Write an enzyme that holds these catalytic residues in place. Structure first.
Site, PDB file in Angstrom:
ATOM      1  N   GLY A 124       5.440 -14.131  23.839  1.00  0.00           N
ATOM      2  CA  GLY A 124       4.429 -14.601  22.899  1.00  0.00           C
ATOM      3  C   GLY A 124       3.744 -15.792  23.544  1.00  0.00           C
ATOM      4  N   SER A 164      -0.479 -24.384  17.579  1.00  0.00           N
ATOM      5  CA  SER A 164      -0.885 -25.503  16.738  1.00  0.00           C
ATOM      6  C   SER A 164      -0.108 -25.475  15.436  1.00  0.00           C
ATOM      7  CB  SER A 164      -2.382 -25.430  16.443  1.00  0.00           C
ATOM      8  OG  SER A 164      -2.692 -24.257  15.709  1.00  0.00           O
ATOM      9  N   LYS A 206      -0.413 -11.468  19.869  1.00  0.00           N
ATOM     10  CA  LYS A 206      -0.005 -12.617  20.653  1.00  0.00           C
ATOM     11  C   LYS A 206       1.427 -12.536  21.161  1.00  0.00           C
ATOM     12  CE  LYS A 206      -3.289 -15.567  18.196  1.00  0.00           C
ATOM     13  NZ  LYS A 206      -3.425 -16.799  17.390  1.00  0.00           N
TER      14      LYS A 206
END
Ligand SMILES: [Mg+2]
Ligand SMILES: [Mg+2]
Ligand SMILES: [Mg+2]
Ligand SMILES: [Mg+2]
Ligand SMILES: [Mg+2]
Ligand SMILES: [Mg+2]
Ligand SMILES: [Mg+2]
Ligand SMILES: [Mg+2]
Lengths: 103, 173, 173, 173, 173, 173, 173, 173, 173
Positions: free
Chosen positions: E45, E125, E33
């Site tokens: 990222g 998240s 990522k």
């Protein structure tokens, strides 16, 4: 630095030959050339990299003064050293604040 | 966010908090929500969605540059762009702008609105709070304009969970 | 509906609008949302079905004696049944109770709210606004606990489209 | 609301913010969400209507003796009625209880949560954040069970728009 | 997903988990990522939706190639494309980019935002979690930058069900 | 908002409140909702959304200038633009326009409608209220036209929470 | 939460993860979702508020004796009250019970589920996955009832973002 | 639908059920969901909506013909079309494609993803099921690739109500 | 609506009810839902929304005229138009078409599907009903094709409230 003097009819070679028309004699100093160059490279990096045409800028932004008053200097000779160059090229222009778009 | 502006005795103050709230969390407490325009002679403060607020602000900026900075005009012009015929993006935000001449808030839906008389304007989620405060103060205290604003924002922040304490008060000599 | 309770320099005042409303229409404007109780010793305003109020300010009378007048207690005890009783949870409202020493806001859902080093209370939809004005005032002006509530409600009503002008204030004693 | 309980090197600490909130507005900031019980032997914070808390920390007092002080028991027994009783399911909240030996989190819906080999507890909307800071700290720093909670809450509040600065800590003994 | 970056003592670290979550199931635990751009001199990222994150990343990549890699500039440029007049696709994702100069996160809605001061950034998240962790660490431990990041991600993964343990930490000598 | 117009004995009156309501709060109590058009020989009053009402008004204005001010015609023309083939923005608002000739309300969806016979028209949230009032008065009182209107609006404002008391009554000699 | 019960070549095994979770965050990972009962004669795992479990595995103890140990009965009788009692319908969960002869899954809504000619049970969000792995294994491999459950859970956890690694198995006897 | 593919020992198998489900009914049990491409040297299997799956497949087919069948490339190309600037139809489906070189699944939203390592891929509503099965098998049985697939699908069908037993297993010598 | 078709012994029958249902009321009981195409050599029956069914039918008609009536081809062609790149209106309906060659149903979303083997096809709300009937009959009775259809529709109508008794059975010598 190299493009500045080496080639046939280099920028310096040109301004030099031109002022020689008004009856003026200019002489570029290595140390000056070095600065003119550091200058170009700078702004190209710091703002919009336009390649080597940039020399045509720093060059004209420097020779402004002599280029104008050179008519009324017949007989004299002019020496473009660092202290000169350094004083024809401000330092950095416009607040250039690109923050007004950031949070 | 809370953005309030008060105008009294040749003074025009437009200041606001600095909290960027993503959902129920905090992105950044320091944020300049009030800024300067037109060489720094007209005050601005945006509310709503970071994205749409900024894109509203910028559009108001082009207009000024295009109308000798004449505020009021500039506004109605921009407003017009939403009233033409082809409904523009319709930015969900609000701007409070003012200068030596007048104060004025502009929605991104297409309208320009003027202050009651107390020359008090306030947008944002905390607005009305800061409003009440100032709407009060002004009516009962010779507090400066650059003073009422300062206290009103604070009163808000202590009430609106989306309005913090890191203010930014741009006044106009 | 906007209720506000102020406390400054020996005076405990509570007063608020009087606009009962059904959805987006007005149903009554002369109403009294502030009432006196316990032998005119404890005054208290409400924000909900005025009935819901009495059925509450009645359960407060009794639940106040038991604990020997001590206001806060009578309250803390009140919110203790308002949530455990399946015949009270159906009485949604807000409440403000005050007397000689302190002042307190009662809640049907949450729990008692003790004031700040400013001694100010507020409920109703227009609440915070009123609060926003009050606080400010009791921080700069030397106004009366009754000259503040006064102006504060004005500031509310003129914003909340459910709060109006016919307020009823109740100083003490 | 953010509550966090740490346990490191002989000390059992529990402390949290103090921001009661109604929707997106602040209603009280001086509140105490951490209280002592059982003759100052067991300290415990909450996260819900403070009343709901007492009506719970009261049903815990009694439900603790019966099983002879054994904390965990008093708890496991508590969540046993919180779900079977139709007068408790209406008391939604979160709870943290700790004493000399261990520490535990009580739930109205789910069931008791015993800590990890780190002995840390957290509830409230801002919980995990606090937890996120704590854990880290009690893994690298040699800070006090009270120098951690301290900093941990700071880290929470500055993110959750419902958790603030006025926290109330409670070491032991 | 969790993507956090810390910057201290000439070091800039941007690392993140590797979990691709389809609904409540796991597509693949190993996923890069965080990646390198501009001949490998600027760190990136992405967070959000695989599709829109990648399409955000790519767009940031074109800008760099077009602006001597000058980060900040490149960003504001891209941002501009959303503020022009024709609302672009509006990718639902987020990017954390940085190099020897500065750190900066960019939403796909149209804005560029800067770090508080602790030079800590974290999207996804699990972000806030890793944030808290690092926001802590940094304030209390001379832990490296390539170290804080490593531990912060982990703290997150043990909390966010959509954030695993297969990290990828790209630093910048 | 409430906008009503009555026509009797060579008199045509079109007046309305002045309240701009943002959600359940008040933007500004003074607002001119009835204005003059075509060198000041045709009366207008807009209702609905500030943005779309204004953009409706303006469009009706162009038509007049383009049809020797002949009202009725001008209207049907504008209406036509919505009935062509390419569904225009479809402004959510309503206009009550009239002059020495006739009265007429125009929706922004595409239609022009005429009064029953009592020459009474009223749009806005308070309309029907003011309507009823006037629909009454007219049938039972030789009250002027510039009089019925004045009283009808008021009757409304005391009922519609979105309709205030700062009227503006433009009549037509 | 993933629970799986296998039965192969004289062994009755039941074991599952240990991840209590609140929405999309982890609240505990060391939990035991498989417990022994009836004098260590009947082992059984759950999937719901662990409390809801006990209050169920307790109503199973008693409701098992009455019918003289006969497992299936105790169960069928259990789901008979779980739906008729208004104090059980509020105990949503899943259950697996097994002993020397057979194995069975209990349901709060539906009704008892007897295994297939394979003798395998599974519940929880990650269930089927586990099941998917198990079944396969007990159809080709000659693995242990305890070497299967083992691997099966691994396969679940690595997919369900609510099931993890810390499982607790329980062979017999 | 269930479509799974396993790759081991020079063998690549991609097979799936054959059920077309309209709402909760069955259109046709026999359906070829896995097919051959590029003169029959690259395997394909589509999932999701009949319409959008087919239109996804076809688009992947054009790419191959245009890139000497070089799979990986072809994929990233197609993916690119969604990442350009003009958001294409955005087909709601998924494809599992592979050949002598590699395996790869492609969503119709704009991404290409690769297998963990077990070279196991599975899309559809039953996927994860067949996945688990194979993810297991592979780790514990020298079963062929054209064998694991066969059994995994079946395990699924006996679980997913939208996945039947009429398979189609296309392998690649 | 119910439209079913059966094919056996050189016979192809496609018939359907005739009820046009507006909401829960009946527009007209007599309606020809099955019709003839291509000089009357290919059978058609449409289902769904009157508007979109007819517009589907017509589009299938152009194709035939353009492909020497070669059914199958014609279909795939039309289907293609939805799979191209610019998502067409996407008619919500369904067509059952057949001739001396084959039977085939076409959705307006973009696909052509073929019958199991029993050469039985049925669309509409009553379809499956008529289907079951015929799917049965065929398997147990040498009833003609023009006979099964007749009885199957009826069986449906007596079940689907949107399917009446005024049939229309077009067969193909
Ligand atoms: Mg705040
Ligand atoms: Mg009002
Ligand atoms: Mg906070
Ligand atoms: Mg995780
Ligand atoms: Mg009113
Ligand atoms: Mg998992
Ligand atoms: Mg099935
Ligand atoms: Mg019928």
């Amino acid at each position: 630095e190299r493009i500045l003097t080496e080639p046939h009819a280099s920028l310096t070679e040109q301004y030099k030959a031109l002022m020689a028309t008004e009856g003026v004699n200019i002489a570029f100093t290595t140390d000056a050339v070095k600065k003119i160059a550091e200058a170009a490279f700078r702004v190209n990096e710091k703002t919009e990299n336009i390649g080597a045409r940039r020399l045509h800028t720093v060059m004209e932004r420097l020779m402004d003064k002599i280029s104008f008053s050179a008519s009324d200097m017949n007989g004299q000779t002019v020496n473009i050293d660092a202290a000169y160059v350094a004083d024809a090229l401000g330092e950095v222009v416009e607040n250039e604040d690109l923050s007004r778009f950031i949070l | 966010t809370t953005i309030v502006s008060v105008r009294r005795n040749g003074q025009v103050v437009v200041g606001g908090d600095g909290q960027v709230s993503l959902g129920n969390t905090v992105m950044k407490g320091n944020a300049r929500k009030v800024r300067r325009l037109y060489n720094g002679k007209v005050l601005a403060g945006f509310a709503g969605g970071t994205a749409d607020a900024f894109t509203l602000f910028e559009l108001f900026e082009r207009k000024l540059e295009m109308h000798q900075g004449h505020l009021l005009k500039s506004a109605v012009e921009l407003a017009k762009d939403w009233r033409t015929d082809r409904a523009l993006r319709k930015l969900e935000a609000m701007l409070i702008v003012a200068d030596e001449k007048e104060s004025l808030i502009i929605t991104g839906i297409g309208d320009v609105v003027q202050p009651e008389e107390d020359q008090i304007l306030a947008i944002g989620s905390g607005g009305n709070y800061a409003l009440s405060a100032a709407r009060a103060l002004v009516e009962n205290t010779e507090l400066s304009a650059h003073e009422i604003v300062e206290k009103s924002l604070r009163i808000a922040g202590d009430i609106c969970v989306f309005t913090n304490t890191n203010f930014t008060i741009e006044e106009l000599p």
